[PDB]
Amino acid sequence: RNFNNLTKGLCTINSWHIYGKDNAVRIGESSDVLVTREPYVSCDPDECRFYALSQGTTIRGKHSNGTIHDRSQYRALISWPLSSPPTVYNSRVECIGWSSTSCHDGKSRMSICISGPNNNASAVVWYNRRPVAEINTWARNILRTQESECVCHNGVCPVVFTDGSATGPADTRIYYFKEGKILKWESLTGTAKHIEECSCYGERTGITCTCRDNWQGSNRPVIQIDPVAMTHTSQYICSPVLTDNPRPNDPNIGKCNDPYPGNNNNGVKGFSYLDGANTWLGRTISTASRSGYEMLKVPNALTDDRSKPIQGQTIVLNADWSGYSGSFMDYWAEGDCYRACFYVELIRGRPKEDKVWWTSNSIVSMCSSTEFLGQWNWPDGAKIEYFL
Amino acid sequence: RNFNNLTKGLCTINSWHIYGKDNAVRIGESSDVLVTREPYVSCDPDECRFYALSQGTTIRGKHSNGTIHDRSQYRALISWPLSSPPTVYNSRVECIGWSSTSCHDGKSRMSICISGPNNNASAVVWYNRRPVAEINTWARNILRTQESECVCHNGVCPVVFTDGSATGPADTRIYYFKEGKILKWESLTGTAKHIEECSCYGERTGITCTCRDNWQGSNRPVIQIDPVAMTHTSQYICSPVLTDNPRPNDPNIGKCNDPYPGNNNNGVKGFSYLDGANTWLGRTISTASRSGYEMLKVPNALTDDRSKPIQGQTIVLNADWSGYSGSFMDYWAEGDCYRACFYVELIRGRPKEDKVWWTSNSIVSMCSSTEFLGQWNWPDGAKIEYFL
Amino acid sequence: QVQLVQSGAEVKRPGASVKVSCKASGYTFISYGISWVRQAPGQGLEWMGWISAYNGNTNYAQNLQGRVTMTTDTSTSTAYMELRSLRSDDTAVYYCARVIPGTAVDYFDYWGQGTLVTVS
Amino acid sequence: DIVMTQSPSSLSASVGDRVTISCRASQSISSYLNWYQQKPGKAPKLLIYAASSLQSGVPSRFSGSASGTDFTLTISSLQPEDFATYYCQQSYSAPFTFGPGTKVDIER
Ligand SMILES: *[C@@H]1O[C@H](CO)[C@@H](O[C@@H]2O[C@H](CO)[C@@H](O[C@@H]3O[C@H](CO[C@H]4O[C@H](CO[C@H]5O[C@H](CO)[C@@H](O)[C@H](O)[C@@H]5O)[C@@H](O)[C@H](O[C@H]5O[C@H](CO)[C@@H](O)[C@H](O)[C@@H]5O)[C@@H]4O)[C@@H](O)[C@H](O[C@H]4O[C@H](CO)[C@@H](O)[C@H](O)[C@@H]4O[C@H]4O[C@H](CO)[C@@H](O)[C@H](O)[C@@H]4O[C@H]4O[C@H](CO)[C@@H](O)[C@H](O)[C@@H]4O)[C@@H]3O)[C@H](O)[C@H]2NC(C)=O)[C@H](O)[C@H]1NC(C)=O
Ligand SMILES: *[C@@H]1O[C@H](CO)[C@@H](O[C@@H]2O[C@H](CO)[C@@H](O[C@@H]3O[C@H](CO[C@H]4O[C@H](CO[C@H]5O[C@H](CO)[C@@H](O)[C@H](O)[C@@H]5O)[C@@H](O)[C@H](O[C@H]5O[C@H](CO)[C@@H](O)[C@H](O)[C@@H]5O)[C@@H]4O)[C@@H](O)[C@H](O[C@H]4O[C@H](CO)[C@@H](O)[C@H](O)[C@@H]4O[C@H]4O[C@H](CO)[C@@H](O)[C@H](O)[C@@H]4O[C@H]4O[C@H](CO)[C@@H](O)[C@H](O)[C@@H]4O)[C@@H]3O)[C@H](O)[C@H]2NC(C)=O)[C@H](O)[C@H]1NC(C)=O
Ligand SMILES: *[C@@H]1O[C@H](CO)[C@@H](O[C@@H]2O[C@H](CO)[C@@H](O)[C@H](O)[C@H]2NC(C)=O)[C@H](O)[C@H]1NC(C)=O
Ligand SMILES: *[C@@H]1O[C@H](CO)[C@@H](O[C@@H]2O[C@H](CO)[C@@H](O)[C@H](O)[C@H]2NC(C)=O)[C@H](O)[C@H]1NC(C)=O
Ligand SMILES: *[C@@H]1O[C@H](CO)[C@@H](O)[C@H](O)[C@H]1NC(C)=O
Ligand SMILES: *[C@@H]1O[C@H](CO)[C@@H](O)[C@H](O)[C@H]1NC(C)=O
């Protein structure tokens, strides 16, 4: 084979349709389904799989008590077939760690996992299922990464890493990897002030990443990466439509080179597709908590600070629970453009439901279409009562 | 394909990082995980798997009562994917017997299993999943072997076998196998006095094995094997750092051609990498029982009887449980050196915990790196209370 | 069980020599070194010397040189020490002991019961 | 002349009363110091070797450490059976030497 090259553009997005759904929590009521969190989706040339961080126990077991924690070090990155539940008998382990990212470059897969204490943390980069290279911690405070699919171009796969206070000016680095080796890295530049958990997609040469600002605002930062040059810039999405959670109620005028205030020290991972008049933004529906999910069509959201929605689609009702979301694309699909897709984590259990001692999620995913299709919401559908 | 040839050297070892972990005991609380003991790790050209001896029952079942025994003859050698638990629905059986060893020579896999009574015991050598050859017992007292990965060079795979009293001068033989056939064997020579359970790795032509002396001391014996010549020698590690368990407190001066006294008729399988200034030793932390686990960097430990540690890393705390440990390498990985790796068995249940009627283990494994990485301990993490 | 067993008490007149045996049991004799100390009544332990496990090279305390020799019989697992030209101030309990490296001195862990030699 | 002294030369303590005994070498013997226990009529017993390694079979009440050329042996509680003369041995270089010994008697 050869490496994937990001030469096609993005398809016109008129509406979204169901791509996949595992119903992991419903199934897990009476089967050996693993407790997971922080899912993402990724596709190889002939297969799509779900990825998630496992807590090392089934939902129904007794070790699910206390899985609310983000790291226990019993945590690992696993992968299982699209729309099947993450069961104990069908999952493959990619690597071990409490934070991760992965992707396929056209020849093989790269996976990165971060493990260890909050101080002496470390990252291990795997390629073709073997460890290749490692990165130690530099700011000594929770080394962390994307929790999403990475995007490669001609073998080069840029990855965003953060190290430092989550309520302060943490540092940031971008590493450029090839076959698991480190070719370069850069300190973060541009006007974004704080970056965590980037969601990236490639298009017509170049990678766009939507990331989160957990420090000062509701206008998510964007990193624009040139994988050939191995250079980058950053800014915020100008649109007055705010996309983080919790967030302020929308203003008339947004901001571009500075975060938009009112909700400090918080936020949720999310995504956007930035393409001029073909621009779409994702966000929760409630401004107070992680519930609901919708897609809005907002022309020129990246640069127009007065732009507003002209269309949209509901994915999850505000009556349902939501979670982290992010983007992905199948870069080996036939056609003259890439079909944009995204996923949403649906969180059940703690911290919102106190009737159980665990936390878990179901996965729902959507892909775009050029047709105008109808809409339906997609609750995880589990009865919490059945676990009580 | 062709046979694997041990032409590369050993990589510099500055620190260790997580390679894999199954969390078998935690998972087994509410799933069909098999009761196992005495694990090892082995890699084929495109895959790493865990190997262990199964007791033929799940942890949670009623036949787990009494699995404390080393042989029941319901025992078999099984193999399952790296970092997955050894479940009943995903394991492959390599062969049957209460003692075993295995490896891949570059074309196919060899597996050896020992079965039968303590008197009329026998070994069956399998290759490419068919029986090929057999060895009967010669000293009539528990024929036993390595419980670790074997190492092949140009198709020749040396294997260490012991037969005789475990508290006396048991005999020892080394067999040289090719495609499951016996080409040669030798009586043990050199100055080591008692050998059991060898852990071996190959490097830059030649195989080094660290073995255990269950009769007279805490300074583990070493076998140096020349696979081309099919000859060997033996000695003890000179270093004053003792590595067996139970063991005496460390002296200033060690011994080289005679075992180091104070703890007779006991010990645990372990390993070392002997490479001059790149030498590392593994051992338990407690001297009284099988708990904790650490790696020490001890230059010239093989020959310098006054050498001391200059660096080290904790893998398991002395507060946790430990078990047998051993070495392995991926000999098909790309690069100019072999990356050293090792595993540790984490034993839970009997004989230390009387609240359960079973015994079982979890597996944790590590690989070296040239980088200086931070450290974290790795408990199996099961709550015994959940099985009570 | 490791034990060291010494010869019983003897009385000598000055100018005489005395040979004190020490039989080993419970371990390979030739793998451990042997040393001796003596304790004169009311005194501490005076090192006499040390003999190497494999070659018998010996090392004698300086204040005793010219009067002392050490040897072993590996077929009987027995060590011997001999003093010559005894004086009344050589009265002491002589002890044999085993040393862990047999090729170096680092810790004498096993001791015999002691042999009392009186010179008069 | 490989020189070492003991301090206290003698002491006493009530049973259960924790004590410390020190030895001082002239030379930089490092870790090469062993401690022995001798009772009347008996060959000396070992307690500690290589400065701080306890000998198997020796009660956990015994411990020790060293700094510079100053070595100490101490106990937790004082055992009814540990009244003995204690000695340090310098194993660093031949001639091997012992300190004069420290006698711990019973407080009255
Ligand atoms: C079968 O399926 C189809 C496909 O799904 C269904 O059709 C969809 O129905 C949904 C219903 O929700 C629509 O979503 C809402 O869209 C409005 C925006 O309206 C746009 O579309 C109008 C339709 O007419 C034209 O276009 C159609 C497209 O083909 C065409 O066929 C038709 O002939 C015609 O051409 C336009 O008229 C409208 O533009 C007008 O107004 C502009 C304003 O300035 C003006 O400039 C234009 O010239 C023109 O005058 C526009 O194009 C969204 O506003 C709405 O989103 C709000 O409401 C939802 C409801 O829960 C909420 O979740 C969103 O967050 C948002 O909520 C606001 O209030 C919240 C209160 O707290 C606040 O928190 C939010 O942030 C938000 O805040 C408001 O104020 C701030 C600050 O001022 C501002 O920034 C915010 O934007 C907002 O104003 C939904 O997105 C679909 O678009 C529609 N899709 C299609 C393709 O038709 C169909 O119904 C299904 N059938 C059945 C039987 O079920
Ligand atoms: C983030 O991660 C990093 C990486 O993991 C962490 O750094 C690690 O921290 C651990 C802490 O445990 C260290 O392990 C211990 O190492 C000591 C040995 O010290 C070495 O390193 C010192 C450091 O300074 C120099 O090197 C660093 C390396 O890059 C360099 O950066 C720095 O600028 C400087 O260059 C050296 O100074 C020291 O040498 C000195 O002393 C020598 C003595 O003669 C002298 O010759 C030298 O010239 C020099 O003066 C040396 O290089 C180990 O001793 C220790 O192991 C003991 O303690 C652990 C604790 O549980 C125990 O488990 C071990 O078994 C062992 O325990 C002893 O006592 C037990 C009591 O019963 C006994 O049973 C044991 O057998 C053992 O016995 C003792 O006595 C016997 C007999 O006399 C003797 O044989 C034994 O050896 C022993 O003495 C640990 O291994 C890491 O090495 C360190 N790693 C690195 C790469 O830095 C970092 O802290 C993390 N950060 C955070 C925030 O967590
Ligand atoms: C999950 O773990 C918690 C923590 O141990 C258990 O809750 C404790 O139950 C004991 C029972 O007497 C109480 O005394 C503690 O105060 C409880 N702790 C808390 C934080 O409430 C809890 O019951 C476990 N849940 C399950 C389902 O096993
Ligand atoms: C595991 O097997 C043992 C052996 O049979 C069971 O223990 C016995 O239980 C009977 C019940 O009356 C006692 O009379 C025996 O003395 C017990 N034997 C021993 C060795 O204790 C044990 O209960 C079984 N455990 C489980 C979990 O089934
Ligand atoms: C990707 O683009 C680069 C540009 O130089 C080219 O060299 C490379 O061969 C392309 N890869 C493929 C698979 O076409
Ligand atoms: C391994 O080395 C031997 C040495 O004679 C050589 O003949 C053999 O072909 C080598 N194997 C490979 C795979 O190169």
mmCIF file of N, CA, C and O in Angstrom, chain B residues 175-225:
data_model
loop_
_atom_site.group_PDB
_atom_site.id
_atom_site.type_symbol
_atom_site.label_atom_id
_atom_site.label_comp_id
_atom_site.label_asym_id
_atom_site.label_seq_id
_atom_site.Cartn_x
_atom_site.Cartn_y
_atom_site.Cartn_z
ATOM 1 N N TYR B 175 18.280 -29.654 26.096
ATOM 2 C CA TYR B 175 17.978 -30.252 24.814
ATOM 3 C C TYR B 175 17.984 -29.208 23.751
ATOM 4 O O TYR B 175 17.558 -28.079 23.968
ATOM 5 N N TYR B 176 18.445 -29.573 22.584
ATOM 6 C CA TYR B 176 18.438 -28.661 21.475
ATOM 7 C C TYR B 176 17.460 -29.180 20.464
ATOM 8 O O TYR B 176 17.622 -30.302 19.948
ATOM 9 N N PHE B 177 16.439 -28.375 20.198
ATOM 10 C CA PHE B 177 15.385 -28.767 19.289
ATOM 11 C C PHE B 177 15.364 -28.010 17.992
ATOM 12 O O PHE B 177 15.669 -26.820 17.951
ATOM 13 N N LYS B 178 14.928 -28.681 16.934
ATOM 14 C CA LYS B 178 14.707 -28.016 15.657
ATOM 15 C C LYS B 178 13.476 -28.564 14.993
ATOM 16 O O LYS B 178 13.372 -29.750 14.715
ATOM 17 N N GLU B 179 12.509 -27.699 14.771
ATOM 18 C CA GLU B 179 11.223 -28.072 14.203
ATOM 19 C C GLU B 179 10.592 -29.184 15.011
ATOM 20 O O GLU B 179 9.954 -30.079 14.472
ATOM 21 N N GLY B 180 10.797 -29.143 16.315
ATOM 22 C CA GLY B 180 10.238 -30.126 17.216
ATOM 23 C C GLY B 180 11.073 -31.398 17.355
ATOM 24 O O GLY B 180 10.772 -32.234 18.200
ATOM 25 N N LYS B 181 12.128 -31.552 16.575
ATOM 26 C CA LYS B 181 12.934 -32.757 16.645
ATOM 27 C C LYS B 181 14.070 -32.560 17.605
ATOM 28 O O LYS B 181 14.500 -31.432 17.819
ATOM 29 N N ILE B 182 14.607 -33.638 18.148
ATOM 30 C CA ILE B 182 15.742 -33.493 19.038
ATOM 31 C C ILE B 182 17.024 -33.697 18.294
ATOM 32 O O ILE B 182 17.226 -34.737 17.679
ATOM 33 N N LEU B 183 17.894 -32.702 18.338
ATOM 34 C CA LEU B 183 19.145 -32.809 17.630
ATOM 35 C C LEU B 183 20.245 -33.243 18.546
ATOM 36 O O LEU B 183 21.170 -33.947 18.150
ATOM 37 N N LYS B 184 20.150 -32.805 19.776
ATOM 38 C CA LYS B 184 21.189 -33.084 20.749
ATOM 39 C C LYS B 184 20.704 -32.847 22.141
ATOM 40 O O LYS B 184 19.740 -32.107 22.344
ATOM 41 N N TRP B 185 21.393 -33.410 23.109
ATOM 42 C CA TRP B 185 21.171 -32.956 24.450
ATOM 43 C C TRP B 185 22.454 -33.083 25.223
ATOM 44 O O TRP B 185 23.335 -33.863 24.858
ATOM 45 N N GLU B 186 22.560 -32.306 26.284
ATOM 46 C CA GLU B 186 23.722 -32.320 27.143
ATOM 47 C C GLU B 186 23.391 -32.381 28.602
ATOM 48 O O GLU B 186 22.403 -31.803 29.059
ATOM 49 N N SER B 187 24.242 -33.037 29.358
ATOM 50 C CA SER B 187 24.106 -33.007 30.793
ATOM 51 C C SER B 187 24.560 -31.639 31.221
ATOM 52 O O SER B 187 25.495 -31.095 30.638
ATOM 53 N N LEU B 188 23.999 -31.107 32.279
ATOM 54 C CA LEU B 188 24.451 -29.806 32.754
ATOM 55 C C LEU B 188 25.891 -29.747 33.214
ATOM 56 O O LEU B 188 26.336 -30.570 34.015
ATOM 57 N N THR B 189 26.604 -28.718 32.767
ATOM 58 C CA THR B 189 27.969 -28.496 33.228
ATOM 59 C C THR B 189 28.162 -27.116 33.822
ATOM 60 O O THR B 189 27.225 -26.316 33.916
ATOM 61 N N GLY B 190 29.385 -26.837 34.233
ATOM 62 C CA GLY B 190 29.735 -25.552 34.830
ATOM 63 C C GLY B 190 29.645 -25.623 36.345
ATOM 64 O O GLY B 190 29.691 -26.718 36.909
ATOM 65 N N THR B 191 29.567 -24.468 37.007
ATOM 66 C CA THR B 191 29.643 -24.438 38.455
ATOM 67 C C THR B 191 28.323 -24.220 39.157
ATOM 68 O O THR B 191 28.286 -24.176 40.385
ATOM 69 N N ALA B 192 27.236 -24.066 38.420
ATOM 70 C CA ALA B 192 25.954 -23.902 39.081
ATOM 71 C C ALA B 192 25.623 -25.219 39.759
ATOM 72 O O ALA B 192 25.886 -26.277 39.194
ATOM 73 N N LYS B 193 25.008 -25.192 40.933
ATOM 74 C CA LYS B 193 24.729 -26.449 41.612
ATOM 75 C C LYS B 193 23.316 -26.987 41.481
ATOM 76 O O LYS B 193 23.099 -28.181 41.669
ATOM 77 N N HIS B 194 22.349 -26.131 41.209
ATOM 78 C CA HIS B 194 20.974 -26.580 41.094
ATOM 79 C C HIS B 194 20.223 -25.635 40.199
ATOM 80 O O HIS B 194 20.305 -24.422 40.377
ATOM 81 N N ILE B 195 19.537 -26.166 39.198
ATOM 82 C CA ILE B 195 18.810 -25.309 38.281
ATOM 83 C C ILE B 195 17.370 -25.642 37.990
ATOM 84 O O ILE B 195 17.071 -26.744 37.548
ATOM 85 N N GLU B 196 16.498 -24.658 38.150
ATOM 86 C CA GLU B 196 15.098 -24.810 37.790
ATOM 87 C C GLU B 196 14.534 -23.548 37.126
ATOM 88 O O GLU B 196 14.998 -22.440 37.388
ATOM 89 N N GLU B 197 13.495 -23.713 36.315
ATOM 90 C CA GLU B 197 12.724 -22.570 35.813
ATOM 91 C C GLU B 197 13.483 -21.420 35.109
ATOM 92 O O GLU B 197 13.282 -20.254 35.451
ATOM 93 N N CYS B 198 14.307 -21.711 34.114
ATOM 94 C CA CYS B 198 15.094 -20.672 33.455
ATOM 95 C C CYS B 198 14.287 -19.689 32.601
ATOM 96 O O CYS B 198 13.336 -20.069 31.920
ATOM 97 N N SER B 199 14.709 -18.421 32.647
ATOM 98 C CA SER B 199 14.204 -17.283 31.872
ATOM 99 C C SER B 199 15.280 -16.826 30.925
ATOM 100 O O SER B 199 16.337 -16.382 31.380
ATOM 101 N N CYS B 200 15.035 -16.922 29.627
ATOM 102 C CA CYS B 200 16.119 -16.674 28.697
ATOM 103 C C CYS B 200 15.816 -15.601 27.663
ATOM 104 O O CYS B 200 14.684 -15.423 27.245
ATOM 105 N N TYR B 201 16.883 -14.945 27.216
ATOM 106 C CA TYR B 201 16.802 -14.004 26.110
ATOM 107 C C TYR B 201 18.030 -14.154 25.236
ATOM 108 O O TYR B 201 19.104 -14.530 25.716
ATOM 109 N N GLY B 202 17.901 -13.842 23.962
ATOM 110 C CA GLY B 202 19.046 -13.926 23.075
ATOM 111 C C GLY B 202 19.632 -12.580 22.750
ATOM 112 O O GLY B 202 18.902 -11.594 22.709
ATOM 113 N N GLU B 203 20.931 -12.547 22.474
ATOM 114 C CA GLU B 203 21.551 -11.304 22.062
ATOM 115 C C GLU B 203 22.858 -11.402 21.312
ATOM 116 O O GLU B 203 23.817 -11.974 21.819
ATOM 117 N N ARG B 204 22.917 -10.800 20.120
ATOM 118 C CA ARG B 204 24.144 -10.702 19.340
ATOM 119 C C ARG B 204 24.881 -12.018 19.274
ATOM 120 O O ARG B 204 26.098 -12.053 19.453
ATOM 121 N N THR B 205 24.122 -13.070 19.029
ATOM 122 C CA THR B 205 24.538 -14.454 18.989
ATOM 123 C C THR B 205 24.819 -14.944 20.410
ATOM 124 O O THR B 205 25.766 -14.519 21.066
ATOM 125 N N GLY B 206 24.025 -15.895 20.865
ATOM 126 C CA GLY B 206 24.171 -16.424 22.211
ATOM 127 C C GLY B 206 22.942 -16.162 23.047
ATOM 128 O O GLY B 206 22.239 -15.159 22.886
ATOM 129 N N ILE B 207 22.661 -17.101 23.924
ATOM 130 C CA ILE B 207 21.499 -17.041 24.777
ATOM 131 C C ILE B 207 21.864 -17.031 26.238
ATOM 132 O O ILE B 207 22.679 -17.824 26.711
ATOM 133 N N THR B 208 21.289 -16.099 26.953
ATOM 134 C CA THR B 208 21.557 -15.994 28.369
ATOM 135 C C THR B 208 20.342 -16.360 29.166
ATOM 136 O O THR B 208 19.250 -15.847 28.924
ATOM 137 N N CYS B 209 20.511 -17.261 30.116
ATOM 138 C CA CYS B 209 19.387 -17.654 30.937
ATOM 139 C C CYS B 209 19.601 -17.462 32.407
ATOM 140 O O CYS B 209 20.586 -17.936 32.969
ATOM 141 N N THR B 210 18.625 -16.886 33.063
ATOM 142 C CA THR B 210 18.711 -16.726 34.498
ATOM 143 C C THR B 210 17.793 -17.752 35.072
ATOM 144 O O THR B 210 16.651 -17.889 34.642
ATOM 145 N N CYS B 211 18.291 -18.526 35.996
ATOM 146 C CA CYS B 211 17.513 -19.623 36.497
ATOM 147 C C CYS B 211 17.406 -19.577 37.989
ATOM 148 O O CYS B 211 17.887 -18.648 38.624
ATOM 149 N N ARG B 212 16.728 -20.536 38.579
ATOM 150 C CA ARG B 212 16.614 -20.533 40.010
ATOM 151 C C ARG B 212 17.270 -21.699 40.698
ATOM 152 O O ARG B 212 17.226 -22.829 40.218
ATOM 153 N N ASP B 213 17.881 -21.425 41.845
ATOM 154 C CA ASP B 213 18.465 -22.443 42.694
ATOM 155 C C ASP B 213 17.553 -22.624 43.895
ATOM 156 O O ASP B 213 17.478 -21.769 44.763
ATOM 157 N N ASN B 214 16.825 -23.726 43.923
ATOM 158 C CA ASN B 214 15.850 -24.011 44.963
ATOM 159 C C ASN B 214 16.472 -24.819 46.042
ATOM 160 O O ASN B 214 15.765 -25.372 46.870
ATOM 161 N N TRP B 215 17.777 -24.987 46.009
ATOM 162 C CA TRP B 215 18.365 -25.818 47.013
ATOM 163 C C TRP B 215 19.195 -25.043 48.007
ATOM 164 O O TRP B 215 18.878 -25.040 49.199
ATOM 165 N N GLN B 216 20.260 -24.391 47.538
ATOM 166 C CA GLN B 216 21.191 -23.785 48.484
ATOM 167 C C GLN B 216 21.418 -22.276 48.523
ATOM 168 O O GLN B 216 22.363 -21.856 49.190
ATOM 169 N N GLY B 217 20.630 -21.424 47.879
ATOM 170 C CA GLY B 217 21.002 -20.018 48.036
ATOM 171 C C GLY B 217 20.182 -18.975 47.296
ATOM 172 O O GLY B 217 19.268 -19.285 46.545
ATOM 173 N N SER B 218 20.530 -17.711 47.544
ATOM 174 C CA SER B 218 19.809 -16.558 46.991
ATOM 175 C C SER B 218 20.417 -15.840 45.788
ATOM 176 O O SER B 218 19.886 -14.823 45.298
ATOM 177 N N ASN B 219 21.544 -16.336 45.339
ATOM 178 C CA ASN B 219 22.263 -15.830 44.196
ATOM 179 C C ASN B 219 21.911 -16.690 43.019
ATOM 180 O O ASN B 219 22.331 -17.829 42.932
ATOM 181 N N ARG B 220 21.025 -16.207 42.190
ATOM 182 C CA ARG B 220 20.523 -17.013 41.105
ATOM 183 C C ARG B 220 21.628 -17.450 40.144
ATOM 184 O O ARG B 220 22.583 -16.687 39.950
ATOM 185 N N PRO B 221 21.594 -18.704 39.655
ATOM 186 C CA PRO B 221 22.458 -19.275 38.654
ATOM 187 C C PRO B 221 22.149 -18.746 37.280
ATOM 188 O O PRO B 221 21.006 -18.425 36.970
ATOM 189 N N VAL B 222 23.160 -18.726 36.450
ATOM 190 C CA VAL B 222 23.078 -18.330 35.066
ATOM 191 C C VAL B 222 23.627 -19.362 34.116
ATOM 192 O O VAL B 222 24.711 -19.910 34.330
ATOM 193 N N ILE B 223 22.897 -19.618 33.046
ATOM 194 C CA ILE B 223 23.383 -20.540 32.045
ATOM 195 C C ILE B 223 23.703 -19.738 30.812
ATOM 196 O O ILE B 223 22.927 -18.889 30.376
ATOM 197 N N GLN B 224 24.877 -19.944 30.286
ATOM 198 C CA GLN B 224 25.269 -19.258 29.077
ATOM 199 C C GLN B 224 25.312 -20.285 27.965
ATOM 200 O O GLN B 224 26.087 -21.247 28.020
ATOM 201 N N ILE B 225 24.440 -20.121 26.981
ATOM 202 C CA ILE B 225 24.292 -21.104 25.922
ATOM 203 C C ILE B 225 24.710 -20.614 24.559
ATOM 204 O O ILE B 225 24.315 -19.538 24.102
#
